[PDB]
Nucleic acid binder design. Structure first.
Ligand SMILES: [Zn+2]
Ligand SMILES: [Zn+2]
Lengths: 190, 638, 230, 394, 87
DNA sequence: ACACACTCTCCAATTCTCTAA
DNA sequence: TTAGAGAATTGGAGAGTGTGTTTTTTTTTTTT
């Protein structure tokens, strides 16, 4: 029922930007780059912030001012755009990353004023930790009634269903993770 | 599971892009039919066949590549017609039992997959070519059966609903229904629908074509569809930037109001105040623990959680939302709609009305006929073509027919408790169509032609002289209920009432008095019937959403309310604490500048209240309770 | 035809009765018919040597499995825990056909794969590789005692391997992983050994990692299938 | 009706208190022209800072009654003074735009209490103390307004929160399903906090004893204004809090812990160009500038000239800067000379070749005493890049 | 045990109900023409205050719904005839 | 001794049905 | 036409049960 209108408008306009932004020469820039995502190893598409700026200042400003709230809707736009063009296994998921941002902030300027806003910094690395797999969307099997629960999205602590859609089950604990149809992403700290 | 998965493999196999059938494939599909003939009531064979994905894997290649074998083609078509039959028809209802509910949902899931699989244009192309050949015969019973099952196959494919909850697509993107509809155009299958609708001897198929066409157009309303044009690209682009701008602005404003209301120091800074002289529920003055700024807009209830409602106490709600399809689809639909109205409407309506009158033992669904006339009359009026394009429907028989159907639905909704929800839906559909008839006769008055104006006077004369149309609105208002109907029904009813009163008033002006079914009429006496306090309660409920109501809705309701209060002098019926709470919220909102008529009417009636209250202190008690007509009139006497 | 992947994941496909039986027959026929360049039967000799010494463990080479029955070689790294199960069932009855009294010595025989081509470096493992067959190298640093594990009871041992010194860049630090050895693989190594390890890459939940990092991040381990010194 | 409000546990009227502060603003001219704080009000209207300082001595000299009420009840009085200032600020200059309401910061000029003499009688009074800073925490975020969203139907609601307690919804009002509302952390609204640790200064100690310490909390604007080792005067509210016996159990100890809630703290051109041009155009300027160095040293002029030339240096491949060495007996004035020139240049550094020195010449890596994570400690030579580094017992 | 409080007709006709209502407004004052909005705010303020005396558990809108339903009962009419005119 | 999670019970609120005012 | 009494179904207020919880001796490399 409820819909975040601001987010939906951003999704529509960002899709139009990807499909309509012609180069200095005449071909659609990001359409050509998108073809590399067919490779198994590739997940992330890089977008230039100044290119985004040329389409409309309102969209540029909204993205920077509302980034964390809006970000998952940009991924859906790229997912849709790629799916149109060439065949890829449908279980794969795609990511958007921005660069050429016009400004820079000091470490001591990073304060709770700008939680959630798009930002750029620089520093010197002291230590770097191993790679791990991180769960983003779980699939669970409810054992007492043999029914599957899909796209259980995670937050900081590991969360799961406790009662299923199937009403006769009366379960609370007997749930099994499908580690073959769940999906993960690579994670690293520095 | 494994038994069917092993045996179903018999049909054939795929070599790159060439499909090779087995030499006993016909006997194999006969065995699949033998499985279905002894299927369980849970539809287990269908779920097994769906799990094995036989339709997607083999039947589509067989139909596309091996259709030259007409007996095999016939077998495959009838098999998938049985398999694709809608789940509601297979189970007979949405099941109450959780096991059968799960099976229903799984069957419907496989049907959704079949609908996606059928999106290949080659299937529609072969079907259209086959049907084109069959109609050239001017035939055997098996040929008629093949026509029948072709039409029913595309009907079944269209019928199973799209999961908008699964798709979650933005407007102007194509849903499964949209893509399949575009494939109908790309195949040219639509041309055969227009042939069947326009050809007189094909009347037996026209009843099916009505269901096909009405299934296609469901997402697009005719007014906005008539609106479209080639410049819509820039229009949507610019408008969307403006919408995004106002949305951002509204969030900013609301944030700042909250920011000023909150104190500046942190949440543990403390303090405590005594409100000297303001006694508690207890024997002593109130102690206030919150921040100083909060007292500027204090109400004691602010700390309380809402009352927890019982499960069965909840009101009705909508299971649907407004949408727009892709511009290509919108343009195609507009062309098809224009061509149907140009060539097919009057002939098809005559045929369908003939079948509904004759074939009562067959129990044909009248709601489609009413849907189609409601849709095409609205499109025709939105385009403002000559009334001659919709000639067949412009007669008294339609009003009588729909009145008896609507009153039958009303009586059934009251009596047949076990199906009152569906009877309410049927009744709502009938009301919508009737409103379009009234709008049509209203429109032709402002035409330049005296002949159609006289015809308009004849129709309106019969409608106002007879009892039923003027009594019906009061019958619906009397039995409106929050579990029975959602607020959309109430909006349609009150707007139709405003239109009916407008035309009634214009008709009464023609002579010194109007006589009706037998008594001398009086417009004010008729309006006095609506002074029932239940009707006002329904009006107040509709007024709570004035910001979400349409401009036309707000105009209609406020016009009727002022007339009823002022000219009937029943003003004190509106002295209610619930209404006064709504007035308080109304005058508090900074968006009040958009609602000048409503705020001025509110201040006017509150002025009447305070003028009375200055004389008579009993008004503060009466404000808590609903009035009988005698009490409304007695309050001014005291 | 076994190759007809339609409407199912390969894990589901090889679970079906038809494909399971085709895989079973193909591996059995491969065992009986495989010949060397001289026209000698390879597995007659190898099985007879296994039986004479009571060793209860059969080694197969990936290269000539691929060369003769490529369809099985194609499925094998994608669903190892399925095809290896079918392979064990098929090998035991060939052994009993040749040596009918061998059930007196053992009731199970394990097939072990070798010369798998897709070698990976011990720091280039990613989530792309989960639940697949891989090959890596490193030096053992930690090694538990041999302990019994429930199933009946069988031997179990756990080890830790890290990148070989001098294969890390100058002045930086090595990565490492844990591995599990079951049944006849225990005491196939001791600390300081350099080994070549073929196994299945596998992951599971751990509350300590989630509480230490604040994100729902899992732990991983390698199930050994064949171990050999380089 | 605001005139009915009276502070709890006492008998002081809020509205009267607000009026008295406004009279002070409208009347207090500087005793040493519109009122003094009205000058600052006109200035802050254009400067755009969010705060206004007031000296307590002006309040006292204007009215003893208001001063007594301020010191007694700062928690209720200070928000009232905030409201008074904002009323004047927006009654005047109504077209001016400002993002926040103005804060008022009353401050007392000099120390009133030794931090050894704070007693249970002082709790929640406004006090001022002085000392030496020891350590400063990392910045801490703090919740202000929680954001709740329904899992079932995506309906949202906001909860203003009550002295650290959140009023979690039990049921979604739109879809009537219990226990379906979830807190969205990064959509909530936050504020800044920092913890500072302070010690009594060595002058005011009893003989031979070790020093006492206190903990200070600073919010929003003040959250990063001091560093370790320096010395300050602070004004704040003296708070007291109970502590729990264990993280699970809800029992509390019978002896409370106290801290200071900070409100204010204080630390203890063409004309120049033309003067420099004229002075540079004067004869024997090289001798004069050299003579200006180290007046305690009466005869070593050419050494002073060499040091002056090192301070001026060359300009930018080849090393443009200058290096100098001083040799001879110990006990000679050379160390004093190093300390003198060290104090003349902004990027300067000073240390000894002895292992007992305070900071090393060599860079190294160590564990942070707070987080126990690694930190890279660069040496004095690196820190003095584009600067002068003085080395003793070389 | 389980002595749950609730607002029924006997509670509604008690002193904190209609009698207290009858006496609360005789101290109030209203400004009238061109000030109807402010008068309404004052009226609602007193009404919310009064309602909280009668049953301090419900929100004001929910309380109004209970009073709207409960006004139907003959028991409150037996008191209304006294409140109107005089006892 | 003092907190979560789970299971279970009995009391009486909400609606259907028949009846009088 | 409007309202109250007797019978049936259902929510949840409440109780009970199970479980968890700086400071000393010895080696090794490299600095002296
Ligand atoms: Zn379940
Ligand atoms: Zn909800």
């Amino acid at each position: 029922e409820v819909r975040d209108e601001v987010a939906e408008k951003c999704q529509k306009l960002f899709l139009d930007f990807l499909e309509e932004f012609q180069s200095s020469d005449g071909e659609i820039k990001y359409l050509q780059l998108a073809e590399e995502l067919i490779r198994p190893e590739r997940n992330t598409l890089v977008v230039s912030f100044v290119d985004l700026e040329q389409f409309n200042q309102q969209l540029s400003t909204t993205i920077q001012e509302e980034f964390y709230r809006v970000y998952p809707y940009l991924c859906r736009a790229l997912k849709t755009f790629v799916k149109d063009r060439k065949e890829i296994p449908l279980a794969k998921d795609f990511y958007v990353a921005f660069q050429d941002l016009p400004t820079r902030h000091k470490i001591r300027e990073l304060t709770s004023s700008r939680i959630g806003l798009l930002t750029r910094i620089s520093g010197q690395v002291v230590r770097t930790h191993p790679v791990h797999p991180e769960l983003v969307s779980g699939t669970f099997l409810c054992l007492d009634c043999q029914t599957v629960i899909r796209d259980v999205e995670q937050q900081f602590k590991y969360t799961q269903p406790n009662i299923c859609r199937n009403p006769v089950c009366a379960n609370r604990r007997r749930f099994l993770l499908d580690t073959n149809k769940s999906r993960f992403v690579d994670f690293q700290k520095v | 599971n494994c038994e069917l998965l092993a045996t179903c493999s018999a049909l054939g196999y795929l070599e790159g892009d060439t499909y090779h059938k087995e030499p006993d494939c016909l006997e194999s599909v006969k065995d699949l039919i033998r499985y279905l003939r002894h299927e369980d009531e849970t539809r287990d064979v269908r779920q097994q066949l769906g799990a094995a994905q036989i339709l997607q894997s083999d039947l589509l290649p067989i139909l596309t590549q091996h259709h030259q074998d007409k007996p095999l083609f016939d077998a495959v078509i009838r098999l998938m017609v049985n398999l694709t039959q809608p789940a509601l028809l297979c189970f007979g209802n949405l099941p109450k039992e959780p096991s059968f509910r799960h099976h229903f949902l799984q069957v419907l899931t496989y049907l959704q997959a079949y609908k996606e699989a059928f999106a290949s244009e080659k299937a529609f192309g072969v079907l259209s070519e086959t049907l084109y050949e069959l109609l050239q015969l001017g035939r055997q019973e098996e040929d008629n059966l093949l026509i029948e099952r072709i039409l029913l196959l595309v009907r079944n494919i269209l019928h199973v609903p799209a999961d908008l909850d699964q798709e979650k697509k933005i407007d102007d993107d194509a849903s499964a229904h949209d893509q399949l509809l575009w494939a109908i155009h790309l195949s040219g299958l639509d041309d055969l629908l227009l042939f069947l609708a326009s050809s007189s001897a094909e009347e037996q198929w026209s009843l099916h074509v009505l269901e096909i066409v009405s299934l296609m157009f469901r997402d697009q309303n005719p007014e906005q569809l008539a609106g479209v044009g080639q410049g819509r690209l820039a229009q949507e682009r610019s408008a969307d930037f403006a919408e995004l701008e106002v949305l951002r602005q509204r969030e900013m404003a609301e944030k700042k109001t909250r920011a000023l209301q909150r104190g500046n120091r942190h949440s543990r800074f403390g303090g405590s105040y005594i409100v000297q002289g303001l006694k508690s529920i207890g024997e002593r003055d109130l102690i206030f623990h919150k921040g100083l700024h909060n007292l500027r807009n204090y109400s004691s209830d602010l700390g309380k959680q809402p009352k927890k409602v019982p499960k069965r106490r909840q009101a009705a709600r909508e299971l649907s939302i407004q949408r727009r399809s892709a511009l290509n689809v919108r343009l195609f639909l507009r062309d098809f709609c224009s061509e149907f109205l140009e060539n097919c409407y009057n002939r098809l309506m005559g045929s369908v009305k003939d079948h509904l009158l004759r074939e009562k033992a067959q129990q044909h669904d009248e709601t489609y006929y009413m849907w189609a006339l409601a849709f095409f009359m609205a499109f025709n009026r939105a385009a403002s073509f000559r009334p001659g394009l919709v000639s067949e429907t412009l007669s008294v028989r339609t009003f009588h027919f729909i009145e008896q159907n609507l009153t039958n639905y009303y009586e059934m909704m009251l009596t047949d408790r076990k199906e009152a929800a569906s009877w309410a839906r049927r009744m709502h559909l009938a009301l919508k169509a009737y409103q379009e008839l009234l709008a049509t006769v209203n429109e032709m008055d402002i035409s330049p032609d005296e002949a159609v104006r006289e015809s308009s006077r004849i129709i309106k004369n019969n409608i106002f002289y007879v009892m039923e149309y003027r009594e019906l609105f009061l019958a619906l208002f009397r039995k409106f209920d929050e579990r029975c109907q959602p607020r959309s029904f109430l909006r349609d009813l009150v707007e139709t009432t405003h239109l009916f009163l407008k035309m009634l008033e214009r008709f009464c002006r023609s002579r010194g008095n109007l006589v009706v079914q037998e008594k001398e009429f009086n417009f004010l006496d008729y309006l006095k019937r609506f002074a029932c306090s239940t009707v006002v309660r329904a009006y107040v409920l509709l007024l709570r959403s004035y910001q979400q109501n349409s401009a036309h809705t707000n105009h209609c309701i406020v016009k009727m309310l002022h007339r009823l209060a002022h000219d009937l002098k029943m003003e004190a019926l509106l002295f209610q604490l619930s209404v006064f709470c709504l007035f308080n919220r109304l005058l508090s909102d900074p968006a009040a500048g958009a609602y000048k008529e409503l705020v001025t009417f509110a201040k006017y009636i509150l002025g009447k209240f305070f003028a009375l209250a200055a004389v008579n202190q009993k008004a503060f008690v009466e404000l808590l309770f609903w009035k009988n007509t005698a009490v409304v009139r007695e309050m001014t006497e005291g | 035809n076994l190759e007809d992947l339609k409407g199912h994941s390969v894990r589901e496909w090889v679970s079906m009765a038809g494909p399971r039986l085709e895989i079973h027959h193909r591996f059995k026929n491969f065992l009986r018919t495989h010949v060397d360049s001289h026209g000698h039967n390879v597995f007659k000799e190898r099985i007879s040597d296994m039986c004479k010494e009571n060793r209860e463990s059969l080694v197969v080479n990936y290269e000539d499995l691929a060369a003769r029955e490529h369809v099985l070689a194609y499925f094998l790294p994608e669903a190892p825990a399925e095809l290896l199960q079918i392979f064990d069932e098929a090998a035991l009855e060939v052994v009993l056909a040749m040596y009918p009294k061998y059930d007196r010595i053992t009731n199970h025989i394990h097939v072990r794969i070798s010369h798998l081509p897709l070698v990976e470096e011990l720091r280039s493992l990613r989530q792309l590789h989960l639940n697949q067959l891989i090959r890596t190298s490193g030096v053992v640093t930690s090694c538990t005692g041999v302990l019994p594990q429930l199933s009946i009871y069988q031997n179990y041992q756990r080890i830790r391997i890290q990148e070989s010194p001098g294969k890390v860049a100058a002045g930086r630090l090595p990565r490492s992983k844990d591995a599990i050895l079951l049944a006849d693989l225990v005491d196939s190594c001791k600390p300081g050994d350099e080994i070549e390890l073929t196994g299945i890459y596998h992951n599971n939940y751990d509350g300590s990692l989630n509480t230490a990092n604040g994100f729902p991040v899992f732990a991983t381990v390698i199930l050994a299938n064949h171990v050999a010194k380089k | 009706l605001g005139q009915k409000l009276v502070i709890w546990g006492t008998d002081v009227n809020v509205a009267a208190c607000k009026e008295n502060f406004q009279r002070f603003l409208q009347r207090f001219i500087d005793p040493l022209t519109e009122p003094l704080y009205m000058q600052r009000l006109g200035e802050i209207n254009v400067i755009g800072e969010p705060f206004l300082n007031v000296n307590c001595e002006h309040i006292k000299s204007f009215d003893k009654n208001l001063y007594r009420q301020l010191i007694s009840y700062p928690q209720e009085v200070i928000p009232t003074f905030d409201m008074a200032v904002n009323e004047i600020f927006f009654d005047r200059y109504p077209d001016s735009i400002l993002e926040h309401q103005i804060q008022v910061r009353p401050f007392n000029a000099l120390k009133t209490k030794n931090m050894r003499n704070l007693n249970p009688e002082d709790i929640d009074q406004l006090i001022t103390i002085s000392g030496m800073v020891i350590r400063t925490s990392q910045l801490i975020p703090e919740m202000q307004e929680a954001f709740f969203q329904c899992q079932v139907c995506a309906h949202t609601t906001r909860v203003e929160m009550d002295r650290g307690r959140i009023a979690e919804p039990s049921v979604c009002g739109r879809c009537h399903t219990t226990h379906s509302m979830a807190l969205i952390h990064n959509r909530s609204l936050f504020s800044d906090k920092q913890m500072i640790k302070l010690q009594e200064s060595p002058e005011d100690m009893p003989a031979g004893q070790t020093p006492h310490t206190v903990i200070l909390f600073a919010h929003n604007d003040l959250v990063d204004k001091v560093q370790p080792g320096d010395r300050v005067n602070v004004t704040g509210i003296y708070r007291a809090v109970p502590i729990r016996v264990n993280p699970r159990v809800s029992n509390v100890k019978s002896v409370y812990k106290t801290h200071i809630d900070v409100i204010h703290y204080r630390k203890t051109s063409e004309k120049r160009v033309e003067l420099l041009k004229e002075l540079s155009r004067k004869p024997d300027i090289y001798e004069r500038l050299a003579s200006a160095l180290a007046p305690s040293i009466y005869e070593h002029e050419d050494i002073k000239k060499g040091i002056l030339l090192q301070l001026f240096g060359g300009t930018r491949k080849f090393r443009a800067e200058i290096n100098i060495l001083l040799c001879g007996d110990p006990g000679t004035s050379k160390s004093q000379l190093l300390q003198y020139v060290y104090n003349l240049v902004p990027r300067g550094q000073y240390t000894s070749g002895k292992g007992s020195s305070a900071v090393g010449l060599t860079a190294y890596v160590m564990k942070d005493p707070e987080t126990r994570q690694l930190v890279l400690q660069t040496g004095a030579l690196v820190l003095s890049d584009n600067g002068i580094c003085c080395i003793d017992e070389f | 045990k389980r002595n749950i409080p609730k607002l029924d007709a006997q509670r509604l006709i008690s002193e904190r109900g209609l009698p207290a209502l009858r006496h609360v407004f005789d101290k109030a004052k209203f400004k009238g023409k061109g000030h109807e909005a402010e008068d309404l705010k004052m009226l609602i303020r007193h009404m919310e205050h009064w309602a909280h005396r009668l049953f301090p558990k419900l929100q004001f809108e929910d309380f109004i719904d209970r009073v709207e339903y409960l006004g139907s009962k003959k028991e409150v009419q037996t008191c209304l005839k006294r409140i109107r005119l005089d006892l």
